[PDB]
Amino acid sequence: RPRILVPGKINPRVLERLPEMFETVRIERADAALVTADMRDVSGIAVSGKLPVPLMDAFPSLEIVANFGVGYDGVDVSRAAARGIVVTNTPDVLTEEVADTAIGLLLNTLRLLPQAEQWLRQGRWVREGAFPLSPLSLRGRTVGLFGLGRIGLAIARRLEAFGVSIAYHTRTPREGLGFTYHPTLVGMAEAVDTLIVIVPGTASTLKAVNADVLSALGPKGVLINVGRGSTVDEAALVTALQNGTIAGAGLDVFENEPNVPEALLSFPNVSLLPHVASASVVTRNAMSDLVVDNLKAWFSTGEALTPVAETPFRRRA
Amino acid sequence: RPRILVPGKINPRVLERLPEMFETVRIERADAALVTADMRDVSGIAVSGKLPVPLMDAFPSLEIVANFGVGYDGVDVSRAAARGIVVTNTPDVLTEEVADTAIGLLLNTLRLLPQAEQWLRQGRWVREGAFPLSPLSLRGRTVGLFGLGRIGLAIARRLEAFGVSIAYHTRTPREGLGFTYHPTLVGMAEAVDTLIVIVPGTASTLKAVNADVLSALGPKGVLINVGRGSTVDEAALVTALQNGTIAGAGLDVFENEPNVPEALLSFPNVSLLPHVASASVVTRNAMSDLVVDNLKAWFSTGEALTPVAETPFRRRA
Numbered sequence: 001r002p003r004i005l006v007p008g009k010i011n012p013r014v015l016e017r018l019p020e021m022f023e024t025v026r027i028e029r030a031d032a033a034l035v036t037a038d039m040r041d042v043s044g045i046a047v048s049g050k051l052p053v054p055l056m057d058a059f060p061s062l063e064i065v066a067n068f069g070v071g072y073d074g075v076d077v078s079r080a081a082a083r084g085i086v087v088t089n090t091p092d093v094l095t096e097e098v099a100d101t102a103i104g105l106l107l108n109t110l111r112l113l114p115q116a117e118q119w120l121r122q123g124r125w126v127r128e129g130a131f132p133l134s135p136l137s138l139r140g141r142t143v144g145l146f147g148l149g150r151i152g153l154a155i156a157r158r159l160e161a162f163g164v165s166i167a168y169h170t171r172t173p174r175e176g177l178g179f180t181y182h183p184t185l186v187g188m189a190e191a192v193d194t195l196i197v198i199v200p201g202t203a204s205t206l207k208a209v210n211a212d213v214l215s216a217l218g219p220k221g222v223l224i225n226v227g228r229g230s231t232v233d234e235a236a237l238v239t240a241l242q243n244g245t246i247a248g249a250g251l252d253v254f255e256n257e258p259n260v261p262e263a264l265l266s267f268p269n270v271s272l273l274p275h276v277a278s279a280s281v282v283t284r285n286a287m288s289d290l291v292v293d294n295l296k297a298w299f300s301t302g303e304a305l306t307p308v309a310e311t312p313f314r315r316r317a
Numbered sequence: 318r319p320r321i322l323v324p325g326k327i328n329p330r331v332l333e334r335l336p337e338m339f340e341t342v343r344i345e346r347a348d349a350a351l352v353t354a355d356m357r358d359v360s361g362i363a364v365s366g367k368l369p370v371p372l373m374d375a376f377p378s379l380e381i382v383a384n385f386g387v388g389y390d391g392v393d394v395s396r397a398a399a400r401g402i403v404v405t406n407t408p409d410v411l412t413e414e415v416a417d418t419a420i421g422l423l424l425n426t427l428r429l430l431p432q433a434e435q436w437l438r439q440g441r442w443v444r445e446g447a448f449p450l451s452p453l454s455l456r457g458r459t460v461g462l463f464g465l466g467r468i469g470l471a472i473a474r475r476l477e478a479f480g481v482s483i484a485y486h487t488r489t490p491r492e493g494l495g496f497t498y499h500p501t502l503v504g505m506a507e508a509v510d511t512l513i514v515i516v517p518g519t520a521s522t523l524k525a526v527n528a529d530v531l532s533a534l535g536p537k538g539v540l541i542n543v544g545r546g547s548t549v550d551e552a553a554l555v556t557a558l559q560n561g562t563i564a565g566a567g568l569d570v571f572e573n574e575p576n577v578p579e580a581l582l583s584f585p586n587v588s589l590l591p592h593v594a595s596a597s598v599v600t601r602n603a604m605s606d607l608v609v610d611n612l613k614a615w616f617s618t619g620e621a622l623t624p625v626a627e628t629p630f631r632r633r634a
């Protein structure tokens with residue numbers, strides 16, 4: 001039985017299913033200091049969260065890293081590729097769930113539904129009367145999707161049914177769709193009043209949503225981030241909200257989770273979520289299955305199910 | 318200049334625009350006791366909320382009641398019709414807004430987004446870690462719309478883009494659509510796991526969502542009510558939630574607003590809103606304009622813009 005390392009916390013379904021083919025090796029944190037000599041025969045890793053290079057490089061027989069999540073920025077895929085290690089992620093099985101969350105977050109941001117529920121639950125409906133009217137609405141908005149991949153397209157399909165205009169920005173256009181392409185992010189931001197962020201966290205997207213993009217978005221502007229916190233210049237966002245440069249924001253992800261700047265907590269026009277876009281039992285069960293099924297496919301057939309683009313590898317044993 | 322009575326609270330936009338053609342007469346509550354002899358020449362009423370018959374019958378020259386809202390169950394339309402009084406409502410201008418709110422409420426009910434935001438805002442992400450996974454999801458659900466009118470159809474169009482099956486129950490089928498018709502409410506409830514209520518509050522819908530309907534909905538069942546509180550047997554709903562007969566509920570409307578039963582507040586699988594489905598500035602401005610424009614059309618041309626079905630009347634002066 002190949003030996004699979006699981007560092008730190010992971011969905012119990014992964015742990016439950018690894019014994020179908022594997023011996024499991026557990027360490028308490030993703031930390032190379034916890035690796036003992038008896039673990040040097042480990043052939044695979046299943047991981048949720050960051051995988052530091054020193055931990056990855058502690059295993060000379062490592063063949064595969066199975067990442068829990070579609071984003072795999074916590075894995076140094078360049079180093080994995082240089083070592084001939086395949087990296088797998090969990091695309092597709094979470095696409096519709098994340099797109100649902102994005103829409104919920106957008107509606108909560110615009111219509112203040114969480115605050116309205118608080119008003120009721122605190123007894124204010126009885127004592128004070130109606131919750132104040134929301135200054136914003138989805139009606140009449142124009143939405144720009146930064147990213148139009150698996151998840152961005154699913155978000156766009158939803159938004160088509162809400163009667164809003166849709167535009168998008170990607171490095172390469174996706175022709176065949178009826179959406180307006182913008183070759184620059186700032187150009188799209190100028191044209192739209194609602195910006196949805198759903199790109200990976202890479203060097204090319206680092207602080208792409210900056211002061212210039214937020215200024216272009218404009219005074220009716222609403223920012224929704226369901227991608228990675230790294231993509232938004234978080235200090236610039238706080239400034240834009242403070243000054244009324246933009247009208248609101250809804251964020252599922254942040255620069256340094258679980259820490260959220262105190263200033264972001266003060267704004268009554270901001271909705272905040274603790275990175276919950278895929279966080280249902282059914283979707284996390286599906287993600288768990290795909291982590292395990294990648295490992296099973298690799299060790300049984302030599303072909304993973306969902307290798308990442310950077311590692312189109314086949315097993316050599 | 319005709320004199321228009323405004324009893325109790327109304328959107329200030331109504332009050333701002335009435336002077337274009339009318340003299341306004343205000344009373345503090347919708348209460349016949351507040352009517353003075355000098356008010357007996359009043360020719361119209363603009364009202365948000367209930368209009369008791371004794372108040373309506375205090376005005377012998379009354380020609381028109383302009384209701385703020387598409388639902389007009391707070392007006393005794395049978396008595397208005399018997400007196401030859403036209404009744405107007407505010408359809409269409411709120412359709413897309415209410416449909417938006419219904420989807421937001423559904424997503425908040427299923428994915429616990431308001432609770433997840435509370436977890437973050439209370440500091441729990443830091444010490445306790447991730448918000449627990451939501452037991453429910455929209456993924457794989459089958460939705461039954463009780464009502465498929467202006468607003469029900471708008472909700473269905475949205476839901477088509479979320480990849481869920483859609484069925485509906487109305488007294489008469491709407492052929493031409495690709496949705497499955499059910500001739501009974503209980504039959505639809507059997508077949509679906511998600512019931513969205515969007516019918517008017519009438520004698521025929523009074524407690525239609527009862528213990529039998531909730532039992533048929535079943536143990537994965539989610540109830541969303543954005544129609545009228547009268548349509549749901551609220552005591553039966555509390556029992557069903559307590560016993561695990563159904564899995565969750567999201568409610569914008571209640572039997573005796575603003576009072577919500579204490580038991581409903583205790584359930585962690587319930588989202589509650591203070592009747593906010595149309596409650597944005599833009600949509601309430603449009604509703605205000607339609608109340609005033611009905612009154613202006615009536616007194617200038619003798620034809621209202623949006624008379625109700627029960628009063629297809631033309632002005633006689």
Ligand SMILES: NC(=O)C1=CN([C@@H]2O[C@H](COP(=O)(O)OP(=O)(O)OC[C@H]3O[C@@H](n4cnc5c(N)ncnc54)[C@H](OP(=O)(O)O)[C@@H]3O)[C@@H](O)[C@H]2O)C=CC1
Pocket residue numbers: 070071072091092094098146147148149150151152169170171172173198199200201202204205226227228252253275276277278
């Ligand atoms: N909040 C959460 O829980 C979740 C967050 N995520 C995040 O969402 C991301 C996207 O997921 P998914 O849709 O499956 O990924 P895809 O690879 O299918 O799509 C990525 C999109 O981003 C675009 N893109 C990438 N780099 C740039 C760039 N520099 N400038 C402009 N566009 C760029 C791509 O187009 P092109 O290549 O043409 O530029 C493509 O349209 C994940 O990497 C993850 O970080 C996903 C799931 C859960």
Ligand SMILES: NC(=O)C1=CN([C@@H]2O[C@H](COP(=O)(O)OP(=O)(O)OC[C@H]3O[C@@H](n4cnc5c(N)ncnc54)[C@H](OP(=O)(O)O)[C@@H]3O)[C@@H](O)[C@H]2O)C=CC1
Pocket residue numbers: 387388389408409411415463464465466467468469486487488489490515516517518519521522543544545569570592593594595
């Ligand atoms: N929470 C909120 O803020 C809002 C609530 N509302 C409520 O929503 C209601 C619906 O508005 P709207 O869609 O514009 O109205 P419509 O008149 O356009 O649609 C009403 C629908 O209900 C159906 N219906 C009526 N009685 C029954 C019955 N006994 N059994 C089955 N179906 C029935 C009708 O079909 P059929 O006649 O064939 O039965 C029709 O499909 C309003 O009356 C109002 O009370 C609306 C807006 C705001």
Ligand SMILES: O=C([O-])C(=O)[O-]
Pocket residue numbers: 068069070071072094278
């Ligand atoms: O990429 C993911 O799936 C994530 O955000 O966890």
Ligand SMILES: O=C([O-])C(=O)[O-]
Pocket residue numbers: 385386387388389411595
């Ligand atoms: O019927 C309406 O529009 C309402 O609920 O106010």
Ligand SMILES: [Cl-]
Pocket residue numbers: 010011284
């Ligand atoms: Cl998980």
Ligand SMILES: [Cl-]
Pocket residue numbers: 133327328601
């Ligand atoms: Cl109002």
Ligand code: NA
Pocket residue numbers: 189190191192193216217218
């Ligand atoms: Na703009």
Ligand code: NA
Pocket residue numbers: 506507508509510533534535
């Ligand atoms: Na059922």
